[PDB]
């Protein structure tokens, strides 16, 4: 049958029926293989052995790649799916499977390798590290040929025992969703050798037959025995030919281990893999109807390299070949593709010129006016070798210049992009669009889709196409028929009609009138629609939403009006299928919201508005631009063009050569997305500054000024006096900033006053207003006052050094993060997890953490995601190390003829080195004498002050902070924490328990409780939560303790002061809700108090210190709960989808849950009591 | 001074010299060089930094990597002891390392991965699956050998910042115990580059001047912040070439990145890496004595691979070329080094018949018996290609 | 990984053979090795006491854990293999396994872990979920009172009698501390039978 597809499900679909079990864990962009396999087993699909696939979650890849390996040995057939860093871990297993000849596919979505950075996107590095496993090695082009050749792999292991890699380009292929053949189970299982199959069960370990393998040889003979393999090795490539006829009996559709595509007497041919293939194909039939002589060879199967298979397909006439390789091995003599073609020419005496070049790193953009730049150096009189494409490389000279743009695009391809808001629904209703032009025509449809780092509120952009001819654009859309921009905020920021085509189609959201028009668009804007005559269409989506009830949500009134007017199908039927996919896709909701969604197409149709815009728009002229302002070199020539869309335009000498970026640049992205934000009523405000500590993203502080400071203050600035003895004589004020808040509402929740002083407004009404407000409490002095800094009150006088994060509307991780470095940014040191701390922590070109007056703040580093606490550790002994030298220094300081002043701090600090306030006290008053000391010294005695004041950055203590989330604390990094916890390090480890891997979509983790569904739990987690505080407390010198912001505000100060303080490893486990939880996000601060007083969330805390003074060290913080448990779960979708999925297992798992929770509860009781 | 030593010690003797810490996580044959040098710190010795190494044992090679990572981003000079399956567990943080061009050390005591089977025992295995995480990778051919060259990657990583992997053959040259010139502390310091190690200490991680480093990138910018770092890696066999000359001053022993041995006008030549070369010079200078033209080049520097190098000491009269892999790549067209040497000498135009061999699994015998059979084999009417020895 | 398969409740026997070392590679220091031992990496001595595994696994409630040793007690070992085996699920048996590197009289290495539990040095427990199921308490302590001195079984080893040999002011110091540590040990396992 016709589906439409992306490589993902196409790759779990053969993937599901050919294997018995499926050990996996997740990592963009391979994961939704697994989710979905995990799925289709909790509704019963049955593989071509009338069972359902057996899906595992191990603790990491590594642990994945074990399970399969003994799987295998023991007689089960097993797959698995994975990329980038998981496959690296994979890799160790992967020569004991190769090198035993079990026969097994692993499924990669080819995705970069994290090197100067993270980059979750595609190109082969992943697969080119482990070419040397044993494992052969078979690349799809295409969604279609995700299908055929998954096939092709699963058939082939079973008759040669070597384990392949089938692997297509991440996101690129995997996400790309297309109108393909799916090939049905039963005639899978017609291709099957079944006597492979059963004498693969022979060969399992079985105590009624047993026998020995794994064993460990002397030098003697282990040389041999790994040539005894060579036959399987050789006769694969005929293995694989010969399935590959098998499936073009079966499809129509021919494979070959190398296939060729181009003219028959081509002189320039380029040797290429992966989805590139279907890009220089569609430019080689472009070529060569305009008479050049070019050709295209297309590796199939790169592990065995046939040098056979790949030579009979090259024609004669071939003098110059280009290899494209989509990876770099930085130093080698070329790239892997390169040296096999040029190793093979060789070794046949072929006088041909190789020249090998890098394209598409981290899915870079790789278009036919590329593919043409690639043909155009072969024509050249000398080609340019060890090129790039797609960059401008002017440090190196190594990229190839662009000089033309062609259209390659076959006539009668319809082109669309689409520019909506996160949330919208813009991306899933483009996503049904192809499956309505999919399954309803002749025509082939094909979507990839484009998503913002942000969490949400962020950009996204559709590209679709669909035409009589099969689609082989896999490159974004060059010329568009139609664009549709669904929020009209992006007019004016992002130049949305590029590339339109001369009398397209523009079709725009806004409640703008046609006269209106005129002022509203900019002028380049109306130029672009008079000049090329295009047709411009408006549609007023959010009045129509909010008059039925829909909210927000604009999809079905957008999606009604592009059919109406792309005249891709009849209308009438259009609307037909339109209906019929909101049954299908938002069904789940409710009987009422269908037909509040079906009385939006209807509404649709009838406000859609033609704008006749004056032929005049031709000859409009660009603004007046306003007064330009003096922004740092890296905001205006980084930060900004990124965020305008325009990053790949930035030459390679933009960008340093170790990926370091600069602090504190998230203050200049001001996004303002935030509907409503909080107002402040200085009449019911206690000044008690919770606001400030719960706010996500620090939107909201408290101000204190004298009353000379408010000189030029707005009117609206309108301050009180401030409550308490430090404060005494000085003005209040809770100022938020408009452009930086999410509009959440926590902070208004959290409000303790009698009469709520924070009520929550449309931003649009106050901006302006509370724009100026903050521009002026922005740029108060700094006021020293004595407010305790270990209360709530006390610590958010503190100025916080994490601020405009990229995580969510109301996040449950922020707030522990931003208190921190409120506390002690001025000296910590991040060593931070992958994960969403690392993604809304570090994402490039924008850096949340940011410094105070002085210019100090917390140096933040994230290196992988399994080795975040042995990567703090290491940090610890350096900068231990640091110190050290410095200590010599100032030793040697007190021998020499130096000021008595300086020799008394000098004496001060070495004895309270170790102490975080000493050391800041004697320290200061060191680098206060240093510059006059240095004048007034000459010859060694000089240059021994000049050492310290080189080394006078670590005179204060600092404080090593390791933060990531659960998945990483309880699963993959586990191991690594365990140990730096019990090495006795001077470290701080701040564990943010989401539940879930939060980041990845929300899969399950030891740290999810019983009962809870998510990701690769479908009919719910069985297994209690795994216990990290208690386990951690059984060292005895660990300071364990259990915190909860929205619980209780001052247990948490106190466990946080305790832990830093503590000389040795300290564990905070914070709870953090979250999306993935499915809670009304306003409420996020409510939810984390429920959590703790229904004795679902512990808060306690081990002091090891306790114990050194004959006390117990477990403190029971919360013994009593008073909230009902059950209900506690049924306030989150987390919990009740597990009724709506499986009914009657899930009423046994909520008296689990809750047992387990008073078992737990009566522990910490007993060592309490 | 003149002391007989193993290989194993001779580098722990220059790493404990050039590191202030060391992570380590035991594998043999590997593992006696972090055993030696944790019994050196417990006794005291200084390096050349006037203090003792900080010996960490973690929970695995993975933690041992990542410990590097971190230790070398907050400012210490750090190096590593490791092999085989151990390597590979540090390939995922040598990613990281090489990436963010961070000056460090890897010594390996190459060892044979575990296949259809564990071996002990000493090949390019390990070495050869971490050539493509941007590390350099230097060669010790003799227990003098791992002296002078384990000196030469600690002095020419401060200068290139790019990480080096100083490797030599498991049992076979790091548990052969030989006479050998010892080089002093004192002179290695006197050689040590500090205006690099200065500049090294002001890029750690520090509250007081901090910054953001390994963050996410986009599509956009991704692929040309990777060509950024192109300069480093293009400038570092310049810079291990001078490096080398240093220490021919201090040694009198000459290196090259690619060094030559045999008859000036030899027709068929042998490349080849680690101890082998010792075996198969030994038979060059009893083969060219008995009049055949013959010889043989010596690969030290295998990552980044320099051309130039490699031509400069290639005779104008070779005519066959015969490369010698101490690994397997099973199903590959040709082992690591043999593709190499077809690649370098296909883009210069030279027609010379190349053939690629497999030798020294798991430390199987490589004897002169053996490196005659590979001559004998080019000087056949039709050499044999993609073949074994021993 | 261990903690991985153990959680996830599969029907598996996982049988640690605790010899304190890296036997193999010639004895090198690990989180099994005990206080004030002195093993390579660890020239001075182990500061840190010993993980307790027995313990972090008894944590999940549904894992079957036992400490044995046959040199100690032969009735011991047979009831907590066949209890461990039956369970279905998972279960962890720490078997106390004398070694060379311990450096000890190999014709005695039976009698080694006898002194090791009679001196309080190494524990004999069984942790059995079974025994919740059926209202009672799943720990039971199979050797309550020590009658050995502490002291006295660590010079019986040269892995703790190199220590005064290599340190011997600090030497004095970890001896205090691992005798320490094996009653706190011993006081924790009878308040989880209590
Ligand atoms: C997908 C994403 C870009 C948002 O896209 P979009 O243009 O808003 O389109 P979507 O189809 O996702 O939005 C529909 C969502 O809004 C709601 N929806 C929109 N219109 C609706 C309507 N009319 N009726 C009912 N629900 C509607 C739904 O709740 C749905 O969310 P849910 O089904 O997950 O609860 C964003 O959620 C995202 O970035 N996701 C993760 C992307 C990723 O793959 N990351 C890799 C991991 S690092
Ligand atoms: C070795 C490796 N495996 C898997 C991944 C993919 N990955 C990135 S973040 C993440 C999970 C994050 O979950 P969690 O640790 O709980 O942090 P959170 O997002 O919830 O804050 C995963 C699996 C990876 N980057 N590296
Ligand atoms: S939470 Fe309310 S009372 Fe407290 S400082 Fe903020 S506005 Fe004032
Ligand atoms: S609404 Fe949310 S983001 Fe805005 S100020 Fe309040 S807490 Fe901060
Ligand atoms: S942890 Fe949850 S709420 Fe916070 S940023 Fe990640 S997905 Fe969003
Ligand atoms: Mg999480
Ligand atoms: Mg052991």
């Known amino acids: 049958p016709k589906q439409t597809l992306d490589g993902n499900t196409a790759a779990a679909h053969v993937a599901y029926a050919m294997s018995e079990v499926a050990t996996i864990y997740p990592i963009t962009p391979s994961s939704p293989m697994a989710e979905i396999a995990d799925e289709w087993a909790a509704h019963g699909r049955k593989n071509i052995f009338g069972k359902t696939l057996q899906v595992a979650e191990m603790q990491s890849e590594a642990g994945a790649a074990g399970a399969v390996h003994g799987s295998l040995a023991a007689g089960a057939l097993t797959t698995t799916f994975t990329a980038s860093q998981g496959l690296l871990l994979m890799i160790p297993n992967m020569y004991k499977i190769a090198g ?79 109108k393909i053949d799916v090939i049905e189970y039963e005639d899978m299982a017609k291709l099957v050798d079944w006597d492979a199959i059963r004498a693969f069960r022979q060969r399992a370990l079985n105590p009624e037959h047993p026998h020995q393998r794994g064993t460990a040889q002397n030098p003697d ?43 028959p007497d081509a002189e320039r041919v380029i040797v290429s893999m992966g989805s590139s293939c279907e890009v220089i194909e569609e430019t080689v039939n472009y070529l060569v109807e305009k008479g050049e002589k070019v050709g295209l060879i297309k590796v199939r199967l790169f592990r065995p390299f046939s040098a056979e298979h790949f030579l009979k397909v090259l024609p004669a006439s071939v003098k110059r070949i280009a290899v494209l390789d989509r990876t770099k091995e930085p130093g080698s003599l070329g790239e892997p593709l390169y ?72 006539k009668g391809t319809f082109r669309c992009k689409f520019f909506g808001l996160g949330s919208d629904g813009t991306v899933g209703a483009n996503k049904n669009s192809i499956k309505i032009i999919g399954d309803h025509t002749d025509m082939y449809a094909q979507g990839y889709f484009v998503y913002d780092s942000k969490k949400s509120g962020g950009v996204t952009i559709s590209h679709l196409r669909f035409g009589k001819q099969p689609i082989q654009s896999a490159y974004l859309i060059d010329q568009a028929d139609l664009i549709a921009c669904h929020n009209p905020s992006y007019v004016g920021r992002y130049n949305l009609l590029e590339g339109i085509k001369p009398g397209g189609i523009f079709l725009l959201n806004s409640t703008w009138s046609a006269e209106e028009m005129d002022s509203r668009l900019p002028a380049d804007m109306k130029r672009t629609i008079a000049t090329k005559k295009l047709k411009f269409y408006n549609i007023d989506a959010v009045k129509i939403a909010q008059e039925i009830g829909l909210g927000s949500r604009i999809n079905v009134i957008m999606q009604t009006a592009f059919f109406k007017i792309a005249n891709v199908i009849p209308v009438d039927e259009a609307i037909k299928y339109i209906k ?42 660009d603004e007046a631009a306003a007064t330009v302002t003096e922004e740092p070199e890296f905001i205006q020539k980084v930060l900004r063009p990124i965020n305008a869309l325009k990053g790949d335009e930035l030459p390679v000498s933009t960008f340093t050569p170790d990926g370091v970026f600069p602090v504190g640049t998230t203050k200049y992205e001001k996004r303002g997305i935030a509907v409503n934000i909080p107002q402040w009523q200085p009449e019911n405000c206690i000044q008690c500054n919770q606001c400030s500590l719960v706010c996500p993203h620090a939107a909201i502080r408290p101000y204190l000024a004298k009353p000379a400071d408010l000189a030029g203050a707005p009117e609206t600035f309108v301050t009180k ?27 208004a929740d959290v409000c303790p006053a009698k009469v709520k002083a924070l009520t929550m407004v449309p931003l649009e009404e106050v901006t302006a207003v509370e724009e100026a407000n903050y521009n002026f409490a922005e740029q108060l002095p700094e006021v020293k006052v004595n407010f305790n800094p270990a209360t709530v009150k006390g610590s958010q006088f503190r100025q916080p050094l994490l601020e405009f994060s990229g995580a969510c509307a109301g996040c449950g991780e922020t707030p522990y993060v931003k208190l921190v470095t409120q506390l002690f940014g001025d000296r910590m040191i991040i060593a931070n997890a992958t994960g969403c701390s690392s993604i809304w922590g570090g994402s490039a070109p924008a850096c949340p953490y940011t410094v105070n007056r002085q210019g100090h703040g917390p140096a933040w580093a994230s290196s992988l995601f399994e080795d975040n606490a042995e990567f703090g550790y290491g940090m610890a002994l350096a900068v231990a190390k640091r110190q050290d030298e410095l200590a010599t220094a100032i030793s040697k300081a007190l021998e020499a003829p130096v000021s008595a002043a300086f020799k008394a701090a000098c004496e001060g600090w070495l004895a309270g080195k170790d102490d975080a306030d000493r050391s800041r006290e004697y320290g200061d008053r060191i680098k206060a004498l240093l510059p006059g000391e240095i004048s007034q010294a000459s010859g060694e005695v000089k240059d021994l002050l000049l050492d310290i004041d080189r080394q006078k950055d670590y005179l204060t203590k600092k404080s090593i902070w390791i933060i990531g989330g659960d998945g990483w604390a309880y699963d993959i990094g586990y191991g690594g924490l365990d140990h730096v916890l019990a090495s006795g390090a001077n470290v701080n480890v701040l ?176 060592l309490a009591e």
């Open 991 to 1166: 564990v943010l328990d989401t539940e879930v891997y939060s980041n990845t979509g929300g899969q399950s983790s030891k740290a999810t409780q019983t009962g809870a569904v998510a990701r690769f739990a479908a009919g719910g987690k069985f297994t209690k939560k795994k216990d990290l505080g208690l386990m951690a407390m059984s060292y005895g010198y660990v300071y364990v303790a259990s915190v909860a912001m929205g619980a209780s505000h001052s247990q948490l100060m106190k466990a946080l002061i305790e832990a830093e303080k503590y000389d040795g490893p300290s564990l905070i486990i914070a709870y953090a809700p979250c999306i993935n939880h499915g809670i009304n996000m306003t409420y996020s601060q409510r939810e984390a108090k429920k959590a703790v007083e229904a004795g679902y969330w512990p808060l306690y805390r081990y002091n090891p210190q306790l114990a050194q003074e004959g006390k117990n060290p477990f403190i029971l913080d919360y013994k009593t709960p008073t909230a009902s448990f059950r209900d506690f779960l049924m306030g989150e979708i987390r919990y009740t989808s597990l009724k709506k999925q499986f009914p009657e297992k899930a009423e046994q798992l909520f008296a689990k849950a809750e047992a387990d929770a008073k078992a737990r509860l009566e522990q910490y009781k007993k």
């Open 721 to 747: 006096d401030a409550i308490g003895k430090e404060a005494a004589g000085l003005k209040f004020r809770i100022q938020v900033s408009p452009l930086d808040c999410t509009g959440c509402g926590n902070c």
């Open 339 to 410: 040296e096999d073609v040029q190793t093979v020419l060789a070794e046949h005496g072929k006088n041909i010129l190789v020249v090998g070049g890098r394209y598409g790193l981290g899915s870079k953009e790789f278009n036919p006016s590329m593919v043409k730049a690639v043909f155009d150096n072969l024509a050249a009189t000398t080609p340019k070798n060890k090129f790039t494409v797609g960059i401008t490389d002017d440090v190196t000279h190594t990229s190839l210049e662009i000089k033309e743009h062609i259209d390659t695009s076959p």
């Open 580 to 621: 019929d996919s909101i049954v299908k896709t938002y069904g789940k909701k409710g009987d009422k919201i269908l037909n509040m969604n079906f009385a939006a197409v209807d509404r649709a149709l009838e406000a859609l508005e033609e704008i006749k815009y004056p032929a005049s728009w031709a000859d409009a002229v």
């Open 221 to 263: 003979i282990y040389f041999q025995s790994r040539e005894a393999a060579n036959p399987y090795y050789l006769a694969t490539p005929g293995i694989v030919a010969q399935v590959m006829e098998q499936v073009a009996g079966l499809t129509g559709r021919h494979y070959h281990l190398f296939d060729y595509a181009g003219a």
């Open 100 to 178: 035993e000849l079990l026969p097994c596919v692993f499924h990669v979505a080819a995705r970069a390798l994290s090197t100067h950075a993270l980059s979750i996107f595609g190109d082969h590095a992943d697969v080119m590290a482990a070419r040397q496993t044993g494992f052969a090695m078979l690349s799809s082009a295409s969604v279609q040929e995700v299908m055929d050749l998954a096939l092709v792999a699963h058939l082939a292991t079973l008759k040669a025992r070597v384990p392949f890699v089938h692997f297509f380009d991440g996101f690129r292929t995997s996400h790309e969703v297309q």
